[PDB]
């Protein structure tokens, strides 16, 4: 399987309580390892995983340095965008940035990412070639022209397919027993009568890692993907995730149904008959 390193940045302007709230989170796969919050007392890049705590002070000093530089440009970007769009200082706005990279099982570069959003809508993004950008509206085009003129993607590519990749490999090694682990889902089913003619079958998956999982309801073999309710995969809070899928079924035909479960932690996909 492949791995990934993700950084997520959020800046929300507070008119006029003061300056933007800034929050930064770093992920390795589905495991958070660092965090910064402009409102926290720490004012430092903080660790959120055991393996990252190994890094010396020069690393931490460097990261808090860089994460404040990040926020100071998002802080200026809020001002710039408000001007691009001709918006009033009245309303509150949001900038969101994500960047990162995927590597394969042998640690080879796979994909580089960098996407920006404004008020929850695509703004600008680096294309897959890591050499060109896509603007979402005519405002983002002003940004696009600026970044193209300055050749800003070159330095960005050098990070995405180089620095990012080499440090991801580093983390995967230092936290190998935490990050290169797999936790299979613990599964069971529950019955819920709605009326005299119907009932819900629910398939539960608990305590699994990583968070990617596929829960399919089947009837006599066929897939009922069209009539199944899934909830968003949720964190148990202890490093594992939970999820369920439900079908409304004619009673009594519950015995014709099966839950199919796929997960990187399972050696063979699961088939559970009610």
């Amino acid at each position: 399987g492949s791995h990934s390193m993700r950084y997520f940045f959020t800046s929300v302007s507070r008119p006029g309580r003061g300056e933007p709230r800034f929050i930064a989170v770093g992920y390795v796969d589905d495991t958070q390892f660092v965090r910064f919050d402009s409102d926290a007392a720490s004012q430092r890049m903080e660790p959120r995983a055991p393996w990252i705590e190994q890094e010396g002070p020069e690393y931490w000093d460097q990261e808090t340095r860089n994460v404040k530089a990040q926020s100071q440009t998002d802080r200026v970007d809020l001002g710039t965008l408000r001007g691009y769009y001709n918006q009033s200082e009245a309303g509150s706005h949001t900038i969101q940035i994500m960047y990162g990279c995927d590597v394969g099982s042998d640690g080879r570069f796979l994909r580089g990412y960098r996407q920006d959003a404004y008020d929850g809508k695509d703004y600008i993004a680096l294309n897959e070639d890591l050499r060109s950008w896509t603007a979402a509206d005519m405002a983002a085009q002003i940004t696009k022209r600026k970044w193209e003129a300055a050749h800003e993607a070159e330095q960005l590519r050098a990070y995405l397919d180089g620095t990012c990749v080499e440090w991801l490999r580093r983390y995967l090694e230092n936290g190998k027993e935490t990050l290169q682990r797999t936790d299979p889902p613990k599964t069971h089913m529950t019955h819920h009568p709605i009326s005299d003619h119907e009932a819900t079958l629910r398939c539960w998956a608990l305590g699994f890692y990583p968070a990617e999982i596929t829960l399919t309801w089947q009837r006599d073999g066929e897939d009922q993907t069209q009539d199944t309710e899934l909830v968003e995969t949720r964190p148990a809070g202890d490093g594992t995730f939970q999820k369920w899928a439900a079908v409304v079924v004619p009673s009594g035909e519950e015995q014709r149904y099966t839950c199919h479960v796929q997960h990187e932690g399972l050696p063979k996909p699961l088939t559970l008959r009610w």
Partner: peptide
Amino acid sequence: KLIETYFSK
């Protein structure tokens, strides 16, 4: 590791 280079928008 955070990126070390930054450019305004």
